[PDB]
Amino acid sequence: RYDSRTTTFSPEGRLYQVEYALEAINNASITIGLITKDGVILGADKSKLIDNYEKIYKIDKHIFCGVAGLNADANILINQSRLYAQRYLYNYNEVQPVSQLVVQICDIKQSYTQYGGLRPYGVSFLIGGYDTKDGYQLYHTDPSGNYSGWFATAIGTNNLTASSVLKQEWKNDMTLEEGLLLALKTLAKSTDTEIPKSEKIELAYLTNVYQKYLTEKEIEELIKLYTQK
Amino acid sequence: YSFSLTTFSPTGKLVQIEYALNRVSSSSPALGIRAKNGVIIATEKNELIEENSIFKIQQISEHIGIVYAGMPGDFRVLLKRARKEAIRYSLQYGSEILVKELVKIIASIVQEFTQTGGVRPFGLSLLICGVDVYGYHLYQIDPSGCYFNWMATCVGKDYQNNMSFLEKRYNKDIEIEDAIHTAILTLKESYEKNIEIGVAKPFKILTQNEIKDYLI
Amino acid sequence: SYDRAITVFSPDGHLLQVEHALEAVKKGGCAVAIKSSNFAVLAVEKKNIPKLQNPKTTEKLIKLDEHNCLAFAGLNADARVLVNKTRLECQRYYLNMDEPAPVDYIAKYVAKVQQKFTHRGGVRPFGIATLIAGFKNNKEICIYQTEPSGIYAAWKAQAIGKNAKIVQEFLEKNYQENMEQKDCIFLALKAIFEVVELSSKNVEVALLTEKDLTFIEEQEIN
Amino acid sequence: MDTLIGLRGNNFVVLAADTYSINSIIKLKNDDNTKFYDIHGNKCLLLGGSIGDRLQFGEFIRKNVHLYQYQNNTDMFVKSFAFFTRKNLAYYLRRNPFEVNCLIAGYDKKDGYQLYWCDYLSNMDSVNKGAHGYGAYLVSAILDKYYHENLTVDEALDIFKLCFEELKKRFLLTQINYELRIMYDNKVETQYVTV
Amino acid sequence: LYDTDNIIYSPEGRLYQVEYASEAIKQGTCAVAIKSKDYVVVSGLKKCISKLSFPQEKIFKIDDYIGISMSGITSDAKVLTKFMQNECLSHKFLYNENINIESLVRSVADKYQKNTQKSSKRAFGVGLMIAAYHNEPCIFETRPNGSYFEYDALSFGARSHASKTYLEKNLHLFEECSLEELILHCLKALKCSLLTISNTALAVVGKNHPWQEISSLQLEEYLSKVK
Amino acid sequence: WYPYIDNGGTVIGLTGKDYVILAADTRLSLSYSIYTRFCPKISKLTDKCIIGSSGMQSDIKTLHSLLQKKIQLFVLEHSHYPDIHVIARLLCVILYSRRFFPYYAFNILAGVDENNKGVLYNYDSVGSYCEATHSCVGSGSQLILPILDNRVEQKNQLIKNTNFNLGDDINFVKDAITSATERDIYTGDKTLIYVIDKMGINVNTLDLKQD
Amino acid sequence: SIYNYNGGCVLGMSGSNCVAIACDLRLGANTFTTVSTKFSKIFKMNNNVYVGLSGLATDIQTLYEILRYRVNLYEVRQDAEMDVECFANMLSSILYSNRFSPYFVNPIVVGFKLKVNYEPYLTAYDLIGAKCETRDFVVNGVTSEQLFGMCESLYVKDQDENGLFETISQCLLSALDRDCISGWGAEVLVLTPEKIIKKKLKARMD
Amino acid sequence: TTTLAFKFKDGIIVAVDSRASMGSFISSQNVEKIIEINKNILGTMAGGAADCLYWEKYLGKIIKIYELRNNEKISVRAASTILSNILYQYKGYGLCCGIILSGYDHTGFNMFYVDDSGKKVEGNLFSCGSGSTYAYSILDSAYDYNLNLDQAVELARNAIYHATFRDGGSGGKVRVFHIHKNGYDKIIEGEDVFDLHYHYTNPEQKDQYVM
Amino acid sequence: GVNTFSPEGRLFQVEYALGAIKLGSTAVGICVNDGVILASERRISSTLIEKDSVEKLLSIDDHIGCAMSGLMADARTLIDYARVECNHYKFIYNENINIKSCVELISELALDFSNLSIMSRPFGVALLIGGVDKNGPCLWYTEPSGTNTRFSAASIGSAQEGAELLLQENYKKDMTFEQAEILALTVLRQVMEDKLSTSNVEICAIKKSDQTFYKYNTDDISRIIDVLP
Ligand SMILES: Cc1ccc(-c2csc(CNC(=O)[C@H]3CCCN(C(=O)COCCF)C3)n2)cn1
């Protein structure tokens, strides 16, 4: 009588828990990603006494992830993803391809929607990475274990406006700096602000592998550049 | 028999976590202030109860201390668990557990109770203050299992006003004692027998005489 | 619901969870499979947002093992999990039997797995329907369709997913038994395009032969 | 008693093994088919030891690798394949171990032609020329003397003929039938050398 | 709201699920058991669900000197029958003697009671009458609630009120009745509930007479004697 | 601690056209001492099938009790008595179930099948078995099997007499058990002879030497 | 005798602001057949932590994989490099978790403790993680006696990177030339706070 | 025990002896060593009689279930793989099985040699048992693929004879089955080798044959 | 719950399962001294199916056949369990299992969801299991309630009532095997709506002479149609 039946089908072939988790993520802060020739980009918008990346996390030397949704579930899944990457390296003596890690983490996501009586993870990921077989890859993963591959996408609040801006501006032959400027422009557009503030920005990029996590001053420099244009 | 009692609401919220947050917000005030050379955690508490037996501030390890706002029993359980995890890290690596890693492990343990079946979330919020080779850290752990990195914060009743007070009196380059005075002022705004303070040397909890010496 | 029964009998005798898994299958994209003398053609619908979604990431036309291929309609994550289980069973058979898994054996294994998930406590039914094409031990080609309930049946030409009834009715009037590869592919395409918007980006068609499964280059689709 | 030979060049890799299946003091067969295990993707696992252990370990490895290559829809790298094989051999080293000697050969675009020598203890290393079995004691030196990194495949096969001749003349088991895998120019060839 | 779970009590201090399991016993076919100083005779009505049907088995042999009749759900009856048969055989294997009848009945009652205390389980929906000869003709009745009793005569199933009344009228004869008259008494009790060789089952057990079903010709002549 | 002792004693089986004879001694002994002068080795399984085993007595008794338990359970479950062949496969499986800690008991399963022909299955400890027209297990088996081969087969005699009757077979079995008692220290005391034919099982006793 | 199957030897030494880790390059079989000569026994955990594993080859590889797994997990979770002393403690605990069925490996840990001040850190181990932390040199492998003689007679305190390279290479080569089952090439790594020098010595290959 | 099988123009010839012995004592000379797995596949028994019998009947059970499930006849390769995989799960427990699975499937006539060690050697001429060496020698000296059914039967009979003649553990009766496209036939149900010695080697029968 | 009694003393779940067996194609089973014959209709859903891939008549063993009604996915699981158990009996005892024993095994499996002493619900299947054992030919009926009833002649499926009525009308003990076939197909013709044809029905027979499961081909069905009134 106290059981909620989290792993049951709704009358429409829909899972109510998965839909509500999707809603919760849609109410999360916006995270974006796009592919350049130089590498992958992930942008994200974060009281004055807060000291501290809370949207972008490193999974492996060649994989990193932007988060949307519940932060604690995101931390659990990030830890488990790091575990999978390291176990792949342990088993095969080679780095794990990005798609394989995405499939493993999404399987863990989905088993919570098929097995047991627990709730799903209320988190969605933008997994960016580089491997030799498939070059640079960006993946979107939703709470139900479905995933998709993208050249540029957005998650979180107002993802439609960011998606429209990305589609209108994202080219194939854009360099790292142009990609970063586009990322800042999308972050500003989705906030409905003419200028993006340099305290609500989380930018990082992965290139061939090395990852840069931009400090506030480098963000300020990128803001100056974006403002000149 | 094992099924989640914490479930997504139709709007995407975890109402049990929101209710635990309400409970913590209706709890006694605690706060922390990270100084340039140290970090302090302070808290506020009938002629019969022994004071020494109900200290909210506790010691996780020689350089790590913890305070809470919420349910005392949950705090006792989580304190024993945090001590266990610190000792496990010490056995593994031969050094004191780093503050951030302890915060992550306890955050994972707290999040587990928001998803596993047949358990309610922890009805407490934690402030963990510690020193490691990478400086002084002051972290807050929520009932949800998320951990924030702070320079200063308050986690109990009327904590909006206390947060505003700390904001209007916080400077990074502050001695330990300037921070201790600011903390006492903040607690007196929320409100020597009513004050418990711990400071980071190995983590230390101020004696009643010392606290009164600060109240002058 | 660790061990709570999810699929139960309704007062009328129905297993509502299976009808809901059927609804999940109906929500999915259309796929079509057509059998010939010694080869098959599988054409599935694809829908991606142009210029932003990588079109190579999603593969609903799945190779299972050396000789057997699969297509599905329904929930994608459930489909991936069931496909991985099927691949594991194909290799387990080829290890214990020393012979590759025949199409009928694989289809029966998928059907029994779906039935099991429909008949165990603490598990949700798979909301996916599959078309599995392959070769039997006698080297004969066969196409099987498995449903969420766990029922399976062999077909000459079958369509699954959204608007499957219309594609079935079309294929009934058009499937002229043995057909050449080119026009068999054309039939597999003009049947699926009766429901999906006419565009080379709204379909992927592959062909299974005794040698291997080959995806058709987009020039021919154009 | 299962002689295995492996040779690696800049543009080829050749595996070789006698084709005897033995049972006690009798040859069950003079054309074995349980030592070589071709793995899709220009990979090959040449196992020596006991027929039961060879079959079990080789087929376990082969089906796991094919399962990997089907689930991921990609070819496993030869180095990943070799280290997966060594890992699996080491896992069972202390629990019902397979007493099998292994040569792993392959070709990749990432590391070129690749040869790996692994013993029943699962001591594995990449080599340019390796041997397994008692016959090793009579062929390794030959491979050392006549090898250079720029050998053509035909010169490698002549060196293999030298090895087979020494195995016929000096090795106590007058082994005369051999099977060779030749991976080069993207193609994998099977050859049978008698005497 | 109190009949929903197996482990709940009503305000009246009643278990409604167990009482429903017992109500499942009223719709079984009538069976009757009676005893004299040496024998127990069990007679039951076989259910017939169509003309082309073969009559349902009504009595079962548990051991050389132990048999049973059932009323209620048949699958639960088969489970209990297998339990009892394996118990008697395990006793005869471990030791070299027949099982004490009270012990077997008490173990069956334990099996009944166990199911009543857990939510995941439901009570056995069948009532069993056990007829045996362990130094004496003995009739036991088990119930879903885990309680069992010992009877001089017993009947249960559909319309056992007529069989009851007949047995209560004739109880004082059974002790001093002979085997043939005891059989005829049980058959007349069974007839009150309404017999042919097909729709009636009849077995006897007693002193130096292992559990044995009455043959077809014997049943025919006995039914003629009833007429 | 070695968990196996051999209690001695012999069982001899012999089949005819429609009858089977199983004669076993009853002495129970340990090393050079006698536990007792009467411990039956032959058990009745059904009215047309018996089993007689030699080896370690406790194993034999447990095996026989388990066979009887399983046969009665089979009767109660499938509502018919098993044939001797069904019992034979059942006992083979029961024996092989302990393949790695085997019963120290060699067995002879004698009976009359549905077609009223004498059937004799001989078993070793781990389950291997075969049908036979004459068998012998126990200490005296190596002494007695040639006698049975010389009388029932006559492979090495040109002039052969084949017409045998039940009385002749019973007297021959008595002579064979007498010889076993004469030459085997572990064979002696009273012997029980079971004769199975259409009418069922008949048990007779014969006294043998007591030394 | 298990260690005689593959042979091998590892040698760590320290100087002034520099440290050195050297190993032999042989992989043998059945104690006398040299099957490889490129089998390096030195593995890099991070810029400031190196390990040298000697003993059974399979155990060396398994332990290296386990150590890499643990170190990569630690570093990613902390966003910082593992401290050398913490790595040594972790290696000891990993070794002792298998006390009764151990990895037949005799590792040495070499590197720099960071305080910036780069203090050389060395420590030897047995197969069950018995600490042998030392400030001058550490030895493991079958050539342990010869190596102890070399580092006893020839070790000089506070040598620059060139002096340390010369001393360690001479010690290793002289010890190896008296060992049947170890040799066939020598690898030497000299770490300083800014750069690492890797050299392959010209040694006997007999 | 001496079992052999060889593939020839008209199918497969399977031949066996029938002796089971316990050390130096011949316990039986009427053992059936050619076990029917299914209607088309035959197996032989060499080594542990209990192990071979139990595991070949178990393989028959698995095969019957498989055929019922998949509405198809299993191949010799698949059955041999199943048997080898099952026998490998018991590696180290002392199972002693030498079996030759020979049959006809959709891929033709097949013959596999499987022993308890896990072997699965495929071939067209095999022999198992203490007399396997003599059988191999005789078969190799005169094996031809285009032998007629009669010629193949004679060759198999002579090889079995010679093995029994030189080998202590082989003898009894020679049984020869012929596997063809439609099952198998008992060409020689059983022939005592006593006659075969005085047919092949000492036909004049006027003095002892000298080896 | 699944294990809940009703106030009348009947389990709700098996009661609901009773409505499921009423669906599906109709089968008829007739037992005569010479053997047992099971004949089933096939309501072919479309012309694109391979008619013989859908099977209503299966062989639990060489001497046992079964006609299936209700949820076919559940029925296949039941028949597979029956096959495994019958082969296990054959291996342990080296004889063909009695038909009633097989039906009782099927029944004990069918009610395994109760957990009195693992499936989660009742099977919702009706089995018409015929065979020939030492007792001769026999025919049994099993339903989700777990009660198994021996029948001289019986019918199952959508037109169960009509087929049963006809079989009662036209069945007598003294019947030849050919008369059994003729009667089975007469009832089948009268019940099905699709006109009877050589491709519309399955006929399987287990005869006392050989006790072997024989599935009819097109020639035999055409013969019986040629003999029909
Ligand atoms: C395949 C097969 C063939 C024969 C037998 C079999 C079992 S018995 C028998 C005939 N008799 C003997 O072979 C005796 C020979 C001496 C050793 N024997 C003992 O009984 C001594 O052990 C005392 C306690 F067990 C048996 N043939 C079983 N399977």
UniProtKB/TrEMBL annotation, chain A:
Any one annotated GO CC term: proteasome core complex, alpha-subunit complex
Keyword Protein biosynthesis among UniProt keywords: no
Compartment list: Cytoplasm; Nucleus
Main location group: cytoplasm
PROSITE patterns on file: PROTEASOME_ALPHA_1, PROTEASOME_ALPHA_2
Signal sequence segment: none
InterPro entries for the chain: Ntn_hydrolases_N (IPR029055), Proteasome_alpha (IPR050115), Proteasome_alpha-type (IPR023332), Proteasome_asu_N (IPR000426), Proteasome_sua/b (IPR001353)
All residue ranges annotated as the Proteasome alpha-type subunits domain in the record: 2-24
Transit peptide keyword on record: no
CDD domains, sorted: proteasome_alpha_type_4
Keywords from the UniProt entry: Cytoplasm, Hydrolase, Nucleus, Proteasome
Subunit structure: The 26S proteasome consists of a 20S proteasome core and two 19S regulatory subunits.
Protein name: Proteasome subunit alpha type
Gene source species: Plasmodium falciparum (isolate 3D7)
Lineage: Eukaryota, Sar, Alveolata, Apicomplexa, Aconoidasida
Automatic annotation (TrEMBL), chain C:
GO MF: endopeptidase activity
GO biological process terms on file: proteasome-mediated ubiquitin-dependent protein catabolic process; ubiquitin-dependent protein catabolic process
Primary location: cytoplasm
Protein's cellular compartments: Cytoplasm; Nucleus
Residue ranges of coiled coil: none
Residue span(s) of domain Proteasome alpha-type subunits: 2-24
GO cellular component: cytoplasm; nucleus; proteasome core complex; proteasome core complex, alpha-subunit complex
Membership in a protein family: Belongs to the peptidase T1A family.
Matches recorded under NCBIfam families: PRK03996.1
Protein name per UniProt: Proteasome subunit alpha type
Upper lineage: Eukaryota, Sar, Alveolata, Apicomplexa, Aconoidasida
TrEMBL record, chain E:
Annotated EC: 3.4.25.1
GO cellular component term, pick one: nucleus
Keyword field: Cytoplasm, Hydrolase, Nucleus, Proteasome
Top-rank taxon, per record: Eukaryota
Subcellular localization, as worded in the UniProt entry: Cytoplasm; Nucleus
SUPFAM superfamilies per record: N-terminal nucleophile aminohydrolases (Ntn hydrolases)
Origin species: Plasmodium falciparum (isolate 3D7)
Family: Belongs to the peptidase T1A family.
Gene Ontology MF annotations: endopeptidase activity
Pfam families associated with the record: Proteasome, Proteasome_A_N
Domain Proteasome alpha-type subunits: 2-24
Protein name per its UniProtKB record: Proteasome subunit alpha type-1, putative
Primary enzyme class: hydrolase
GO biological process, alphabetically ordered: proteasome-mediated ubiquitin-dependent protein catabolic process; ubiquitin-dependent protein catabolic process
Automatic annotation (TrEMBL), chain H:
Location in or out of the cell: Cytoplasm; Nucleus
Quaternary structure and interacting proteins, as annotated: Component of the proteasome complex.
GO terms of molecular function: endopeptidase activity; threonine-type endopeptidase activity
GO CC terms: cytoplasm; cytosol; nucleus; proteasome core complex; proteasome core complex, beta-subunit complex
Catalytic reactions of this protein: Cleavage of peptide bonds with very broad specificity
Protein name (database record): Proteasome subunit beta
Functional summary from the UniProt entry: Component of the proteasome, a multicatalytic proteinase complex which is characterized by its ability to cleave peptides with Arg, Phe, Tyr, Leu, and Glu adjacent to the leaving group at neutral or slightly basic pH. The proteasome has an ATP-dependent proteolytic activity.
Assigned protein family: Belongs to the peptidase T1B family.
Species this chain originates from: Plasmodium falciparum (isolate 3D7)
Keyword annotations of the record: Cytoplasm, Hydrolase, Nucleus, Protease, Proteasome, Threonine protease, Zymogen
Disulfide bonds listed in the record: 52-97
Active-site residues annotated for this sequence: 1 (nucleophile)
Biological processes annotated in GO: proteasome-mediated ubiquitin-dependent protein catabolic process; ubiquitin-dependent protein catabolic process
Main location: cytoplasm
